[PDB]
Write a protein that binds this ligand. Structure first.
Ligand SMILES: CC(C)Cn1c(=O)n(C)c(=O)c2nc[nH]c21
Ligand SMILES: CC(C)Cn1c(=O)n(C)c(=O)c2nc[nH]c21
Ligand SMILES: [Mg+2]
Ligand SMILES: [Mg+2]
Ligand SMILES: [Mg+2]
Ligand SMILES: [Mg+2]
Lengths: 364, 381
């Protein structure tokens, strides 16, 4: 049994080491225990990261909370625990793997993580794990795991339009996003057997909670262009200055843009995966459409299964949302990739940047 | 009948006449009402909505209006400061500030039985009017729908206040602070609560004659006003306001810009929410009393919880003078100046449009609340 469990860990880490991690396959391998995918992946990553040790996190409470958090994810076509797991894997990968030419100032007193499943080929590379303190990256990983907690499979617009109690409760501002963060943090405080951050002083915990909220609320698309604008003003402005990883604010922004990219990574994966996710999103949209119909309301754009515009939807999405975000992130040179020759006065190859471009074509 | 209708009119004219003054004697009204004093807010709201014409503009049914505002009052807890009386005071302030004559204010704007949704309505106070063309009032630049939202927001900005600060709630990990992720915890609760109350029952629906567009906008405007009363964002609003209105490279206002209009409206409740040290000594002190008493009530609970008593909240070690001094210096002070610099403050010209004293925009103006502020400041230094 001991060896059997160790084999499973090495197996997973090997699978997850690919940006195009076959998450749907894992779902199958787990079979009936499929519902514990988010907690299992969280455990595996917190180990590979070393966070469990860095913050003396008791294994029991950790699993208690995340096993609970998982059950909070409804059984809907897209915004479910599998999505959360995917978003988690993405932020982990994006802040762990080698980034061509990334200058690592804080190159690992504040603790810094380092994935045991990869390392920079040489000084020509770098990674966020070396510029962003472990506390902050843990907030990101946790935020990712709870960012779509208890999603109803409906959009903020729908909630706001139908004057849903949840929308009235939050004054129509980031309705879902607020509810995700609040519901999850509430769950955490519900029982003492969930408190896995007990070994953090009131100071650290206060900040950790802040960071987690900031990350989750940044996943509200209505604020997409504001983050993007703000991120570029700091990172991609020849009259500005790089980032200054020694700055909390700058670092936070980097983290927010990172989770934003991870939440909508769909079209930046291999076609196989991209289509599987797309199928989920639209099926969920069509359900929302059938309701608007039943409520005698105008069906929202791209949500009418009788008059679909799947390609127009995806083409539009990539063009206006994921695309510009990816470029900004790429321009800041934070995207993991690899050099092409033996010489940023050199050609790099960004696998996800490539996937995005190819996918855009299938929707044109 | 007539002997009953003629008496109802008298009360109206009285209240209006009394409110027609920046230093409206609220507490005197509280007593004049005595046992029916629990309905100050609903009575003032109704009165002000007639003085402005809002009842007619949006064909607001009296029954549902009273129904809702009566219920809204009841939501205000019986605490030392954040109570229906404070609400009524703030409501009166925004009403006054956006209605009385303002020296040199541009009038750039629109100066039967069916509602014409094609035309943008503007309200006009019956209890006053611009002395001459040298004066302009805010109600002439900000559409009725927007001012009505400001007034309604004032009436609900502190709904169900617990008498505790946001910091307190965040620190004690109150269920409400968790719910709103420590962001404008109280302010969020006020708006969400009042709105939930409004949609609670059909007999509260007094806005039943606004089309979906108008309602949607009204709701948005109200929330924006209420949430601006969170002092944590005080300096941010002040900064932004200065950037537009009066700064080195300031632009102006352009009342045609919805955003600028909202900013002005927000800076208004902002001021009206803390008008205390800008009223006459009498009123200023009476308010100061309520605030400290409440601050102390908090300090007590902080103690019963084994928490460090928050600054100025320890009654067995008060620092009232220091408190007010600082507040009038770092908060209300800079706000009034900024608002004054933009020239949006009611007031009156000192001299004739001939101030070229060779024997020594250009003429002199006297702002009542501007001086009250300088005076009250003295009695704390
Ligand atoms: C689900 C939706 C709010 C955002 N979103 C997304 O994240 N991915 C990956 C898509 O392909 C997509 N297509 C439309 N909307 C989309
Ligand atoms: C009540 C408090 C949050 C703000 N506040 C206020 O509104 N007025 C009028 C004061 O004099 C005052 N003094 C300290 N804090 C104050
Ligand atoms: Mg989401
Ligand atoms: Mg998501
Ligand atoms: Mg308040
Ligand atoms: Mg108030």
């Amino acid at each position: 049994l001991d060896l059997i469990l160790v084999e499973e860990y090495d197996s997973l880490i090997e699978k997850m080491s690919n940006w195009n991690f076959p998450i749907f396959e894992l779902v199958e391998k787990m079979g009936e225990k499929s519902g514990r995918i988010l907690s299992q992946v969280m455990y595996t990553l917190f180990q590979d990261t070393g966070l469990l040790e860095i913050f003396k996190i008791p294994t029991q409470q950790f699993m208690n909370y995340f096993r609970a958090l998982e059950n909070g994810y409804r059984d809907i076509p897209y915004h479910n625990r599998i999505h959360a797991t995917d978003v988690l894997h993405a932020v982990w990968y994006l802040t762990t793997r080698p980034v061509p030419g990334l200058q690592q100032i804080h190159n690992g007193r504040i603790a810094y993580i380092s994935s045991k499943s990869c390392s920079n080929p040489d000084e020509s590379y770098g990674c966020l794990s070396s510029n962003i303190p472990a506390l902050e990256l843990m907030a990101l990983y946790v935020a990712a795991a709870m960012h779509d907690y208890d999603h109803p499979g409906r959009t903020n617009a729908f909630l706001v339009a139908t004057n849903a109690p949840q929308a009235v409760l939050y004054n129509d501002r980031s309705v879902l996003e607020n509810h995700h963060a609040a519901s999850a943090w509430n769950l955490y405080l519900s029982r003492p057997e969930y408190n896995f951050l007990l070994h953090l002083d009131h100071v650290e915990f206060k900040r950790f909670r802040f960071l987690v909220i900031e990350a989750i609320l940044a996943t509200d698309l209505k604020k997409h262009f504001d983050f993007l604008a703000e991120f570029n003003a700091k990172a991609n402005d020849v009259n500005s200055n790089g980032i200054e990883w020694s700055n909390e604010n700058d670092r936070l922004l980097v983290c927010q843009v990172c989770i934003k990219l991870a939440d909508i990574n769909g079209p930046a994966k291999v076609r196989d995966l991209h289509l599987k996710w797309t199928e989920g999103i639209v099926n969920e949209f069509y359900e929302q459409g059938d309701e608007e119909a039943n409520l005698g309301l105008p069906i929202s754009p791209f949500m009418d299964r009788s008059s679909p515009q799947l390609a127009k939807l995806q083409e539009s999405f990539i063009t206006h949302i994921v695309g510009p975000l990816c470029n900004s992130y790429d321009a800041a040179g934070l995207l993991p990739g690899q050099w092409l020759e033996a010489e940023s006065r050199r050609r790099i190859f960004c696998q996800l940047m490539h996937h995005l471009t190819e996918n855009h074509k299938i929707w044109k």
